[PDB]
Amino acid sequence: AKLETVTLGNIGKDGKQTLVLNPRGVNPTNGVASLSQAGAVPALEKRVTVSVSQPSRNRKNYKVQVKIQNPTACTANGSCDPSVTRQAYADVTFSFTQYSTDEERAFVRTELAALLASPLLIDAIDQLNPAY
Amino acid sequence: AKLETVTLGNIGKDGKQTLVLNPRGVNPTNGVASLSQAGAVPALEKRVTVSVSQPSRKNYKVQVKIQNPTACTANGSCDPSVTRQAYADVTFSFTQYSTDEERAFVRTELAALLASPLLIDAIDQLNPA
Amino acid sequence: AKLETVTLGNIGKDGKQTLVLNPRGVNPTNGVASLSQAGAVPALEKRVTVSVSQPKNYKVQVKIQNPTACTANGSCDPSVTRQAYADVTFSFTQYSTDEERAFVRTELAALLASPLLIDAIDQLNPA
């Protein structure tokens, strides 16, 4: 759809956060859309890059691909420009066959949007405890 | 945590579905946990394979893979086969100094992009941005 | 221009149809834009692929395509039986003005509503 200010609400471990994502234009070299936080230092921006795809002569298979990215700013021992210490990526690559219906693609989306709120993945992502 | 019956509720395009996932044991050769639907034909099972990792690597990788096979009975048979295969793949990657609220932000950001009207239009209908 | 939902109205032999075409992104390997119907089975989609070009001669090239779905004698996924293509390849010289290019467009958009080409396309009667 048309890129707009995606106002993601109720994020965070406690559950009371906001994250407005202003649109930052579609990259024409690879079709990758972009979003970014309104924080006005463009190395310290929460980036989100959705990019759907189409079958070429080598794939024959859709790939909706979402990448978020969260840099963390830490001012050093005497400076004025905060640098990027850590970098907390993520990556979601869906893959739907050329005959996939609407309710087979909107099931994998809302399954993954409900595993990430289940107590099995708020314990394997927040605290890095493996499945045991 | 301990693997249990993950009862995922309110799934689907309409929003009224359920999916119980019984635990199917941790693979010891690569640390990959597993979950599966209670549908008692084990080629037609909704699989979910979470697997966190450790630096061998110098970087964590929480990695979740879901998978949905679709059954279609052919023109005269008795065992339905796997026609299509609708994968997904989520590979987080957190640095060795990542706090709790920097890892539980990337999780709840991705769990809120997938309900936004920008990704229920780029996944359900394959319209690009 | 910017790709948007091209809502083509008043199509069909009777003249009362609609066809919304959602944008489906520019192919970067050959510059070919794309459009597609909102019908959520991506083999059964009305595709439209405009692609202008650059030099010793311009080529605005439009391709539409209409697959038809027919469920077989017992199945669940409808297949593509027929395939009704089209192809429009303009070609304008490097000195062509605005009113020499917008004349060939509106000439072809008025031949396809003339009674000479609603009788040579709808019914395949030659001239």
Added chain:
Amino acid sequence: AKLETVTLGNIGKDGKQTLVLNPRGVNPTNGVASLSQAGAVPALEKRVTVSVSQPKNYKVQVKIQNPTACTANGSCDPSVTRQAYADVTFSFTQYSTDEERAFVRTELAALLASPLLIDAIDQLNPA
């Protein structure tokens, strides 16, 4: 159908033009019909050449062509400076119905009036 004076109305970028096309006979060597403007210099004529075909696949094929006259630096016969072609090659399978062929025609006759192709043909802006 029978070739007649196709009076194409409301053409042009502004939208107030006419173009009468007198019939100019079917070429018997390749079945290509023809039309031409009443402008009585036969190198400076707006030509239109419809030609349907027969098999393993139909091809309704329309070609328009617009030469532009520019008198040189002292002469009496104006020459053909530029040449603004177009080309529409439909292709319908041997089982195509009437409403599958009259959909591709009226889709293409409505894309060429959409604001996505009056911006990619008149001004050569790509998508």
Added chain:
Amino acid sequence: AKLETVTLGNIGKDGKQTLVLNPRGVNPTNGVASLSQAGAVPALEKRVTVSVSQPSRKNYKVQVKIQNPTACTANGSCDPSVTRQAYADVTFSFTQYSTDEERAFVRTELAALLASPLLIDAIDQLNPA
């Protein structure tokens, strides 16, 4: 931003000119946007091609190129040809930590050197410093 009709006003040596630039679409092979004059002969068009970039590289490059062809009808013809070709080229380069007021200073410095009496004498008349 979104490409629109950039109506550049008060140009020229005297200072009373206009130049409307209609948008001519983003080239997808290299990300280069384009603008062009409404003069309806497409070899005689004032072209302007802005193109920002991203680190592949570890450094931004906002790059603007304008171009002005001049038409001169020969000794008997009808299509005027391109005799001369007056280019320009502006390649900014901002580091990955550059703020907003460090990038909007280099822009408005260069937009004020080109109206200073040191560069309306080294560009208009080619007198060196």
Added chain:
Amino acid sequence: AKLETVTLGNIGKDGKQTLVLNPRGVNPTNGVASLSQAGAVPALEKRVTVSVSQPSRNRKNYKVQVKIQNPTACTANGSCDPSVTRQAYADVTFSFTQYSTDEERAFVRTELAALLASPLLIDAIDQLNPAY
């Protein structure tokens, strides 16, 4: 012309800045003039280097070339001499043919001096949004 104190006025994103540029002499090895800010630490100076050119046996084409440069000072975690953290360049290379008139060269100058105040390049330079 003769190098003088170029007092550039009304610069900046808000539009209320000044920048005096004292002349710093013509380099004789390549004809490159120079200007510099009056800030009396000569690594932290806003430099501006105009240099017109002439046809050699390999160019046959004028090149008025302007380069500005803005270093940013950031004192480290305990020191006394501030260092150069970032470096915000620019580069303007005109190129006029040997038959170019006065109003064909003073058009390309005042076109570029009006694109850089247009809302298409105060959005592709200040905020690095590409053309979309």
